[PDB]
Design a protein around this nucleic acid. Sequence first.
RNA 1: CUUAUGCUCUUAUUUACUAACAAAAUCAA
Lengths: 48, 95, 70, 627, 102, 156, 161
Amino acid sequence: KIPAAVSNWKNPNGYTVALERRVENNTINDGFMKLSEALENADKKARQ
Amino acid sequence: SRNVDKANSVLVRFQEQQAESAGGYKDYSRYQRPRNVSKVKSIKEANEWKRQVSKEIKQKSTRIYDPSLNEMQIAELNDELNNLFKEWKRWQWHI
Amino acid sequence: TSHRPQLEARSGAKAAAYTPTGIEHARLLPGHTTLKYRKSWRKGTAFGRGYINDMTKSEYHQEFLHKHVR
Amino acid sequence: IRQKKARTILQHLSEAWRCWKANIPWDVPGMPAPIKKIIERYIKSKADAWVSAAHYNRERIKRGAHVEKTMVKKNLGRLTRLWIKNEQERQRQIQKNGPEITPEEATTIFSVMVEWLESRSFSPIPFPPLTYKNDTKILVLALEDLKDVYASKVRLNASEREELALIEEAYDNPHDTLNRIKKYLLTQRVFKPVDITMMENYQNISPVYSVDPLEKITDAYLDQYLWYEADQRKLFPNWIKPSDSEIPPLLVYKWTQGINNLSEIWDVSRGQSAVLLETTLGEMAEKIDFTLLNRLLRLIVDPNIADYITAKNNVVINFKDMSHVNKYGLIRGLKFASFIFQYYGLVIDLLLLGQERATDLAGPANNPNEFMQFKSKEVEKAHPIRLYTRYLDRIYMLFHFEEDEGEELTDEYLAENPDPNFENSIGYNNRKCWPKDSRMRLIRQDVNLGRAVFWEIQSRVPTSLTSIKWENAFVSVYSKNNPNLLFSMCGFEVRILPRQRMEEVVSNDEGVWDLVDERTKQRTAKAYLKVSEEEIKKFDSRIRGILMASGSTTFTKVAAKWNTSLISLFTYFREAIVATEPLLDILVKGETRIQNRVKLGLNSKMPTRFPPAVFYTPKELGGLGMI
Amino acid sequence: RGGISYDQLAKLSYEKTLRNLATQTQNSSKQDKVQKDTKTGKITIADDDKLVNKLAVSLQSESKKRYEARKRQMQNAKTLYGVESFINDKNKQFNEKLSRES
Amino acid sequence: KGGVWTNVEDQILKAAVQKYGTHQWSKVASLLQKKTARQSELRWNEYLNPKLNFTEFSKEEDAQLLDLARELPNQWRTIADMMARPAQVCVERYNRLLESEDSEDEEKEMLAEARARLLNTQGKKATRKIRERMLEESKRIAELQKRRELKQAGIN
Amino acid sequence: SERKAINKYYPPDYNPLEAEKLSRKMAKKLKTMNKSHASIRLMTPFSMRCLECNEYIPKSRKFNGKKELLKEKYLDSIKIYRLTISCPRCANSIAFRTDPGNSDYVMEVGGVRNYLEKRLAKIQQEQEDDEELENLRKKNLEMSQRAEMINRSKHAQQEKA
RNA sequence: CUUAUGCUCUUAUUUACUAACAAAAUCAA
Ligand SMILES: [Zn+2]
């Protein structure tokens, strides 16, 4: 069975179709973690 | 510019004026009533005028029975059918 | 409406029963009328010392958009 | 399955192609997996034709080989989808695989800049207080810079009419609009999206960013404030260009003087040699990392504004359908994007030069140097980097080696990667505009010393910051086998002979600079000028932009566009046209296309009907006034 | 579960017409050839005038029942749902189709 | 001149996206007087989208947020995609979470114009075909009753 | 034949000036000359509402309509026109007027429209704004310290773990 | 039925309508 086609771009007959029919799952890796921690450890060393 | 402009220029008028003087053109589909009937001319001339009046009768008569839904307009349409009727008779007296 | 996709193509069955015209085209003029038959200053610094089936992920496509955008 | 069910399934094909062009993932819930397999097979099939026609037609537009006026607008519309689709994919590869800078690199990058500013004793720029003595004048210069867009044009749209009203509200209430800007620097961290568009230049496609007008005023005030307070506190040293004190042809002139004025470069009595390096910095602003960028700016800027700058770069970029968040790269379209782009370049300038030599070039903190000056000659003689300067993303390094320093430098390159077949002169690129006598002679000693110079410099900057490549590199060695020193500054193509390396000293025309020593006051070198081939094609593309935009424009607007583009060519490159033979052919073919546009306005191209009096008499007498 | 294939549904509708034909013979009980031509190859079958009328009236009556059952189903279909905004009947009809897909 | 959003214009915009779709924003602004297609797109993508996340803060969310704003300092469009939330709400709570450490007259006419434009779907060509078909049947009805009235007089 | 034609063939016996007399006399008797209501393609700049079939002429829809020179003459001498437009659903003509003094149109039959003490005070507002800016700058530094206090506590929670 | 059209010349000044085609307008004071 094929679902019917509701498009965001075209509406030839001008149908009023509900908003859910008209319109990620990952996390950051540890590289963004170790970058920001090293910049703070470089910064705290620079302040001392 | 619409062909209303292109039909009324000097050259198109000029050859009709020759065809009046060289033959049996003129048409009559061009001109007006003319306002008076007692000032009109020979019958063979007037028959084509009279024939023209029948043709606006047939346009108006076909227009009367439509569902245009305008009571005022069909009152107006009955008035032109009545005046063209009285007009059709005055050419018959002239005939 | 008035702007439609084809449900079927125009068949050659319809043009077969028509009567021909015999108009003379420039590309049906005689040509090729004969067939051929076969027989110490480096210390002070901070720090010194293949084909993919995707047109968009290709290496030539990356070299394209780096040169033609700039 | 009937004519009804075949009719509905073909609409998923159209919807998939629109999602592909929008770079939106096409996923229909409940779609049968064999049928989703068929549609993706053909969307990729249509995409291969769609992209390859965009490459094929792009190569036709650069050659000028009969592209339709509609197809130039279509090819512009195809590449801007391909550029963002390549941009959005590059955003996801940073998001999946982390930042390209490692924590070992960014610790050292941060440590270099702290070491520099501590030696400069740089006081950081504060947040602008309300009792700030220069505050009303910095605000006016910002608004006048925003207003100069609209003194030219006649018509304004609803966005532009909003933009002029916000300036007039700021002229009338100068104290009220400062309190709106000072509040947005302290509080506002989420910004309206940026609409991107792309400009056709027939050789490349340049990007243009459109910032919201109410956010544009607080950017323009910030950009006036940051550039004013940087120069009062002397942030940027002398080598960073554009200089605010010299025009780009004067930057060529001083640099060509300042080479010759430095001692003993031309002297090649011993085995000593001189090396000039030119590299673009690749995708420099494209590789700026915001977390690194926010930490670097806290050294020089009060962290409220350093937080204003980092948040403003993280906005939504909108084309028509296409929309993505700029996670990684710098937006150059911002007003204060110049202050970021040169400050991030100052970090790269310290990685190449080092802390010791960049102190020698920029001089001490209390009494800095001029652009190419040293405090004494002994400071200059140490450390073979003689002159450094940096345009936007283009660096210029002058190395003067001895014979012994040159042999050590070129040995350790050949130790790492030698060539038995002597193939280093193959990929070595030099200037194909000069004659073969005049360009760099491919001597095996100088070529291997040329690549060894670049190999030292490429290793000093990590590949996570900039992509410094040999293909973008131009190195010209001056030696006893090479009498010529060749470089290319801001569109100007320069060849240098000394006075003594010439066979005979012949008198020259306007295209030749006479380079004077400071103390002898004697002309000891000649600089031979040409227009770059990249600038010749840039001017040829402007003439096409006059013609392809003017469909049914009047004759005198075509003549006025020709005059303002011909003056912009000749008043910048003044004396450099004379030595350039390809440019004189473009001027001839370019001016006659303008005249043919008038002749296509009439239905006659006949030469007798159009004497020179029709085109060249002034507008006061009824002519077009073509120059 | 599933739908019914066109071989089974042809069989089931065949059996319903046999049962209905059986009760017509039962009700007719309670209330109380082939010649081929020589000249041509055409064949002639003698029929009673009854059972041809009875077949024709039954086919008409079944068409009436299915027409009015669908017509009454039309009436219920445009009187039940009124939650979502629409523009015409064909809108609500298409958005019933999307509700059937869920 | 930069206006605030009434709940009337809020409902017109929701019904506009329900018909026109999310990419036709100049279609939406045509219904919506005094508002820009940029402003219409900005509101639906920051406020009115029912996919958005306007709710309470679990302690997982607060620990995640203070994690992200520490690891990605001041990158709110990035953080709002990691939190799958709107962005200024994410700033609003980060502003609040740190404060834990403390020491019809016109509108209905627009709405009547919007109510009719959403419910008229045809264009020039279909409305004209309707007009020509009604006028053709009206000419037909006229000519037939002509023939009947002449048949009343006996003349065929 | 051609959009631009240099020569139009005249009859071999013709003249321009004698024709001008002749042509003028013809110009009194035609049906096209006596009726001069100008037919013009136009767009309505002021959404409509029909009064018979209550149709709405969207915003600015094309019409072939009829312009009429009005017998009125705005002020001592300014021209004023009356434009008429037929309705798509029903046969009904709706009329305009063009007011030259008030640039917008006005309409009629068949249609309806959709709708030192002051200087001391200035120093006071100057003083109020600086204190607000000092507070907001103080807020952001406090907001960082409030973030650090959670950051130091979470680090202490890591140490305890 | 009631029922004046047509024919012969002059008086002060250059202005209206079709737009499918073109729409960076730039720029020297
Ligand atoms: Zn109407």
